[PDB]
Amino acid sequence: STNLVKNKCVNFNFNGLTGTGVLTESNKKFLPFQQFGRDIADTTDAVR
C-alpha cells in the first residue's frame, strides 16, 4: 500500500480506477455496497 493524501492536486488509484485531481472531503453518503459516484455527464467524481 501507500498513504492517503487529500486536498492537493495528486494522482490516485482506487479499485483499479485511475485518475488525477484534488481529493476534497466528500459531503454525500452512498448505499453501503456502492464504490463509485458519477454525474449526468458519466464522469467519475466520487469514490468510497
Binding site: 454525474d39 455527464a41 464522469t43 467524481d45
Partner: peptide
C-alpha cells in the same frame, strides 16, 4: 426583466470544455 429572467433555466470542464464569460455583464 426579473419576471422574464426567472423563467429561463465544473464537471464539463473535466475535459477542456471551458466557458469564456461574456463582455457585457
Amino acid at each position: 426583466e426579473d419576471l422574464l429572467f426567472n423563467k429561463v433555466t465544473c464537471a464539463q470542464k473535466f475535459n477542456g470544455l471551458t466557458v469564456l464569460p461574456p463582455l457585457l455583464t
